[PDB]
Amino acid sequence: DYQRCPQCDMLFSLPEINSHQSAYCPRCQAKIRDGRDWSLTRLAAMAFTMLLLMPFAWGEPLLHIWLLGIRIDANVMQGIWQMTKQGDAITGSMVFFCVIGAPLILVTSIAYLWFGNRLGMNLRPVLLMLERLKEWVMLDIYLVGIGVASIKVQDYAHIQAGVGLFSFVALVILTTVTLSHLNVEELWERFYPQRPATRRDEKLRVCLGCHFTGYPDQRGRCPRCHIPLRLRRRHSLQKCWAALLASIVLLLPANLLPISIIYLNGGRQEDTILSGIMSLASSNIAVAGIVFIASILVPFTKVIVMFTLLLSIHFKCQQGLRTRILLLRMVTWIGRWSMLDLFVISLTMSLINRDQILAFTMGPAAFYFGAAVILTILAVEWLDSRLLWDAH
């Protein structure tokens, strides 16, 4: 009935919301609430059909490659297993968590919520994990990666669409529609109903875990979930600065150390991101452009945007507040797509696997690249725009 914006602390009465459209903050125009849409039974049915479809969308080969008279069948599991067997277990695990593990966690969370309704078990942290797992469930990014890799290796060998590609595309569509029609605030209010306020109190706080506006209890925790309720984050600026510095430090090895080692006819190329993007611009510039803008343009843009936002916070500048929030939203929207390079190199090293004529391997820089991407994503997520609004 009445809420406060989690981004600019605008205290406003929220009218009743139908299934059509949604609501937004009057000041900053931020997505605040959703209504109606699908139900928990439909979510459980989607989780069940995903559980049925995922093993046959993963184990089955995505596409068949005829290279040098040899037919090779490859898939996500083969790529990740090759990554772990080479020695880059952390890169293999992060790719696995991004691609395969995150839908598994989503299905497990849906089943856990259903069984909690059936039995009576606690369901508080599972809802927070479900809310924050949408940024990490990435299958369309892997679809773009396999498309890019197929276009890249179209000239090297012969590519035929496999049976597993159709199931993978169906899984991508199902996960996309389920995540788009999955509502977390509705689930929170259904599972743990609460009460609204008198539309004007000027003493309400917004929980950053469940988007509930209200008064903290005598223990200082949120009434809806068992986390403390504060005005802002505890150490938002310190966490953002630490993650930004870590990503800045780790970006240098990702570009200096070689990213791809190509054994051609017994000789290794050992080329970094810059050399690879230069060769790809020389050969197949059409996909080199998207690879460039998704591999090196996005991370540095995010780094400089976060650095300028923190400098504006320190300086208490009040000139471009209308544009800084838009830039932050754009960075939040675009930072998820920086993981395309890891998926592309995983699929290419799974496909091109000749013994000595053509052996593509991932060098000791993709770990630093992925760590930098994860750290800058965490920095963007941990940055609190209410500090930007209070800088005035």
């Binding site: 439909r42 479809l53 199931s167």
Partner: peptide, 30 residues
């Protein structure tokens, strides 16, 4: 509607049946 999950279930059943139909046998050679 439930038509989309029904179609997904039908496709999953079809691919499971296809997988179970034509699995070969294991032969051991020294």
């Amino acid at each position: 509607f439930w038509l989309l999950p029904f179609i997904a279930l039908m496709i999953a059943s079809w691919l499971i049946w296809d997988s179970y139909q034509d699995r070969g046998n294991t032969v051991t050679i020294d």
